[PDB]
Amino acid sequence: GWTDTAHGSGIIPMKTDLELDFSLPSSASYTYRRQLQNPANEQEKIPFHLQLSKQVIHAEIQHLGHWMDATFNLKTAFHCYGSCEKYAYPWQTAGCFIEKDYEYETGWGCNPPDCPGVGTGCTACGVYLDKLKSVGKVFKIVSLRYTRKVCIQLGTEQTCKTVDSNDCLITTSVKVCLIGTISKFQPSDTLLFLGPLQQGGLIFKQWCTTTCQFGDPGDIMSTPTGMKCPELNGSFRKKCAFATTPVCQFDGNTISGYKRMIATKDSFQSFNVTEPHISTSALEWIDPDSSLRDHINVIVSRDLSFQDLSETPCQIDLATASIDGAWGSGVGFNLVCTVSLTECSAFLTSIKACDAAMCYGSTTANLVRGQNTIHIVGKGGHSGSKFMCCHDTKCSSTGLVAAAPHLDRVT
Amino acid sequence: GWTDTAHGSGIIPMKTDLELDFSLPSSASYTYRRQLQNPANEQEKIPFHLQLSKQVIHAEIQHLGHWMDATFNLKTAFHCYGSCEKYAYPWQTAGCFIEKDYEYETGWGCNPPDCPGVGTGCTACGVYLDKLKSVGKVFKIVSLRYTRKVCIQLGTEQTCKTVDSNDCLITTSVKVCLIGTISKFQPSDTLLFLGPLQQGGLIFKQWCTTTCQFGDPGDIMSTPTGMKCPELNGSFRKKCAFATTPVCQFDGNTISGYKRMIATKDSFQSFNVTEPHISTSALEWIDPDSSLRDHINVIVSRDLSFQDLSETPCQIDLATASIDGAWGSGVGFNLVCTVSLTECSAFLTSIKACDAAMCYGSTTANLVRGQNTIHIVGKGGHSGSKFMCCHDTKCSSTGLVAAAPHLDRVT
Amino acid sequence: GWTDTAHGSGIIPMKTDLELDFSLPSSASYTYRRQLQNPANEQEKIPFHLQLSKQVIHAEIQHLGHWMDATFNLKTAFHCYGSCEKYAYPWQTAGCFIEKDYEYETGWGCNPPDCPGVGTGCTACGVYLDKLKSVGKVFKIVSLRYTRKVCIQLGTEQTCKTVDSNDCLITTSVKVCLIGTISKFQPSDTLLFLGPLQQGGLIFKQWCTTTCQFGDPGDIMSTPTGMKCPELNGSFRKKCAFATTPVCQFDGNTISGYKRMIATKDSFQSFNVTEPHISTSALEWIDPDSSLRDHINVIVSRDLSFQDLSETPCQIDLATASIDGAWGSGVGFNLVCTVSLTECSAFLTSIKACDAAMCYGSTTANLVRGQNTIHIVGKGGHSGSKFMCCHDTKCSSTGLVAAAPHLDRVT
Ligand SMILES: *[C@@H]1O[C@H](CO)[C@@H](O[C@@H]2O[C@H](CO)[C@@H](O[C@@H]3O[C@H](CO)[C@@H](O)[C@H](O)[C@@H]3O)[C@H](O)[C@H]2NC(C)=O)[C@H](O)[C@H]1NC(C)=O
Ligand SMILES: *[C@@H]1O[C@H](CO)[C@@H](O[C@@H]2O[C@H](CO)[C@@H](O[C@@H]3O[C@H](CO)[C@@H](O)[C@H](O)[C@@H]3O)[C@H](O)[C@H]2NC(C)=O)[C@H](O)[C@H]1NC(C)=O
Ligand SMILES: *[C@@H]1O[C@H](CO)[C@@H](O[C@@H]2O[C@H](CO)[C@@H](O[C@@H]3O[C@H](CO)[C@@H](O)[C@H](O)[C@@H]3O)[C@H](O)[C@H]2NC(C)=O)[C@H](O)[C@H]1NC(C)=O
């Protein structure tokens, strides 16, 4: 049946004016001009001009905050009598602290010489992190898009459009196809910028998410809402000796995740960025790595036999019915779309979830004549995004905001 | 030397009837019809019909079972006298439990007031998981294949064949090439379905495999063979106080892997599925994500100059000699093939490992005239799979089953 | 503006002598011969010969050493009096050991019957690994390149060149384009060879790097500099009983990472290798997996309208100014290049970082007429590599060595 998702052309190669076929780095732009033969005139020439922008990476991201370095500290506070809750402890002022209480445990083989208590008091053990310093900014990739602006001019008619890395642009007599390739980044990668965005960063595959312990990548994060402190990898001990104050011991890791990373820094992957652009839910940049190459094919055919394979009689109207799920999420939001099809018995097409600035996901819709209900998934966006059901360049007149994502550590 | 692995055509573009070149979403089908000029007749027309199915993902998988939620529980059982083995404990009835025994350790600074024992008895500490509930079904990806059914009709001759995502189909006068792209899934990804397959799921990159501790993704799994219980991340302590029964303490993680995941659910990647088909060793589905696009090129040339580049004089016969390794495995099985070559001094070709329904791997064989011994690797399959050495559409007359895979946790 | 990075051709398809378009396995070579029509003579024919090598994988690697199996051992050494430093312990001779000291802690509820000490002596607890045996060799992937040697002969002129997997080769009348595909390996993957390189190996996504605990993949590594021993996942305990020598206990993992891996071996991905070649900073091989296919397109056009799209008037000279960063690193080294442009107002081109044998990275340089300062990133190489700024086939006359990478565990 009908579909408008085939983006390309049918041609008779005998009737083709020009074909360009080449490899181009993702971070390279390209310009091409040529005077083509006027078949009707054969005196005055028809200009052809092609412009391809550099490929721009658009990563929907989660702002994870600032990764922090810190120094590990362990302190003992002993009281012969009294519950642990009775006393204040110096570590309770720290950015991060964890306290283990040995309450009502005094005994004459573990007491200082001035303490005759038995089953009393408190040995309070405190681990606290201080000298907290931001070492960089951290982003988690929600999704990736790779686009070039493509401008075609043949005679006096120009068409410019943003084209994704494995898509084609088709005009009256011109087809430009991009064939993507290698992807350096993957969804759920974590990017760490140790300095300004322009200086590039490090890719981490195993940034701590469901359990963060001191020593992990991402163990200590500073966010606008506050510190997010790690758990401890190791365990406390109350060392006892006759006529001696108890001594807190900790047997686990005492070196921050940042210092452990730096010690073996060259185990990780760097990436570099040019022209970075930061937005509410996204980072855009051009990767100066010229080893990443796309394949480009351009056809010009001013002949009646040139076919736009996306052309169908089918027409659709869209309305955004409901939403659930979250913005800024790799799980995403689910948009419910009412899609009405005319002029065709059936129509396979692509329905997109877009806000006023950007699209966040597209679903193949198998439509039948009349009304259809289509669920589509979007990933990314922010709390102000009004998500709409869209097709080609047209969107529904109303949009819906999604809920806030769930990105909480349990402790 | 000769090879039949080049799937494509040589043509004179002047002698080409038609070329289609376009981008198509993996989840889109496409149909194209055209009446082509009869060069011998030029009155009656020759029909051309192209049909491309939607691309189907075939993932060989490991059925990891059901991921379970649970509640953490800690209990103390003290006996003044008697070995720990002498007594039964209530946690010994649980789906998962871990017990730490403090045996023959009684002393007058750690005993209840009715216990004068010294170096006797037992403080038994039990961690047990209860309220076990399945939260979803889990599959590990062994391998991935992406195929479309491609049908070509020119005049009265039709050819339909399954074509992989970076392969070509060649008939007498027609070539259809697919150029694959982005892959959302990777081998060793773990897929979690929280509900029916049709509702999609979550991708996990770090599902616990060699060490599973309570709190990890995949910590508690229910399989047909029984529960697979996690180890503990943390350590026990016997808290002592005069004239008091010992109290078991546990300092580690007490929150299940499921609850930790849900708390930060939007850190993970969702995927959606249509038309899912479950089999003994595999899951097949169509991904409704229309942002994944393949490149398609179609050539029609009813001219004598159209060359099938896969044509050679070389002929082979195959026999399956032996096997080792495992089914259902990302390491795979190794099939030993005796391949006999005639009509050519040398022949580079592809030898496949297939059962009666499916192929599981292909190896480039550098053959010389006469008999050859070729080792090929297959991944996936099940205990009933009779694996055969195959070439093109022909297989050896005998096959061999592989051994069961090793997928055991140590404790 | 001008760029030489577009590798391909502009043609009039009517003026094309021949087009080949086909899919080819990465591990397949291919040969094609044809006698083409001489347009000037039309009696004697012009030979065309195409040869494509098998695709070679070049992985820049880090030699991580040998992964070791071992047996866990725990021993107690008690002394009624004396500091722990006073005594030698048998575990101090082991390849790996970790010692926990309970110093000055004697008491009459934890002493052997011959020890009346109070707050004296030492219970020394030693974990040591013995029966250390190498189980395989380990390499971490720094970067990946996929190349074919491509030879073109038309008449008496031959051109052979190494072509990357998404690049094109252009001669006077011939264009050969490669379109890459699926990549089985990723940067930062860890490869384990349990035997000779020819027997293949296992891919690990989560080899321990910043924290290695006994039981992890990569926990125990033997390098030329010495053993790199893991930390412990678990904690010690001094078990006390009246009239009994203290007993050291360890509650954590006691099974090596190798044994845990082997127990669930079929959870991991195997890969196979042919014609492996080992060098100071790299491993090269051909993957016999024939399911990995590239797309190949060949155009021959002996017509004046055939355009080399890489041709520009722009000319550059290079000098290598300075370097920082490290060899053998996925973070890489940063080479500072002085690039001088003539014949053009502006020129977008690719500047490479190469030593005498190999290139390690390329950067898109946006040059303006006159002198430019360009920073480029290279990954890989070794301590003897003299890295140079290069363009096309030309390099600066001087090069600079980089510093040694930081690949240290903290303990
Ligand atoms: C490509 O990306 C890498 C990774 O980000 C870049 O390495 C980074 O380079 C910056 C600047 O050279 C380093 O910043 C710091 O600067 C202070 C001066 O304030 C300096 O004293 C410190 O020693 C420190 O190096 C940053 O640490 C470094 N990051 C890493 C992970 O090595 C690289 O420069 C980029 N290459 C380009 C843009 O050509
Ligand atoms: C695309 O895939 C995602 C991920 O699986 C889908 O999200 C999932 O949606 C289902 C159904 O809406 C959720 O199921 C559960 O249903 C009960 C009712 O019995 C409901 O009360 C619960 O609140 C729960 O949501 C499932 O939790 C959810 N999974 C995740 C990880 O969020 C999504 O709906 C799919 N989009 C489509 C098919 O358009
Ligand atoms: C493709 O690669 C896999 C993974 O390396 C290969 O499996 C490996 O096969 C070798 C040789 O068969 C195994 O070596 C060992 O040999 C001793 C004899 O000295 C044998 O007694 C042991 O049982 C052991 O198997 C190696 O263990 C095995 N590795 C794994 C991870 O299974 C496979 O053979 C390759 N297939 C080819 C080259 O066709």
Author numbering:
A (entry chain A), B (entry chain A), C (entry chain A): 666 to 1076
Which text from the study accompanies this structure?
Hantaviruses deliver their tripartite genome into the cytoplasm by fusion of the viral and endosomal membranes in response to the reduced pH of the endosome. Here we present the crystal structure of glycoprotein C (GC) from Puumala virus (PUUV), a representative member of the Hantavirus genus. The crystal structure shows GC as the membrane fusion effector of PUUV and it presents a class II membrane fusion protein fold. Furthermore, GC was crystallized in its post-fusion trimeric conformation that until now had been observed only in Flavi- and Togaviridae family members.
Nevertheless, in both PUUV sGc structures, one molecule in the asymmetric unit assembles into a homotrimer around the crystallographic three-fold axis. The protomers adopt the post-fusion domain arrangement, resembling other class II post-fusion structures. They associate in a parallel arrangement with the fusion loop placed at the same end of a stable elongated molecule. The last residue visible in both of our structures is T1076, which lays ~30 Å from the fusion loop. The most notable one is at the membrane proximal part of domain II, close to the fusion loop, where E770 forms a salt-bridge with R902 from the neighboring molecule, thereby stabilizing the trimer in the membrane-proximal region. In our crystal structure we observed N-linked glycans only on N937 whereas N898 is buried in the trimer interface with no available space to accommodate a glycan chain. In contrast to other class II post-fusion trimers, where the glycans decorate the perimeter of the trimer assembly, in PUUV GC the glycans linked to N937 are tightly packed between domain II of one protomer and domain III of the neighboring protomer. Interestingly, R1074 side chain at the N-terminal of the stem is inserted into a negatively charged cavity at the same protomer. The main-chain carbonyls of G883, D884, K893 and C894 create the cavity’s negative charge and lead the stem to a canyon formed by two adjacent protomers. Triangles area for pH 6.0 and pH 8.0 are 52.4 Å2 and 114.1 Å2, respectively. We did not observe any significant differences in rotamers of histidine residues between the low and high pH crystal form.
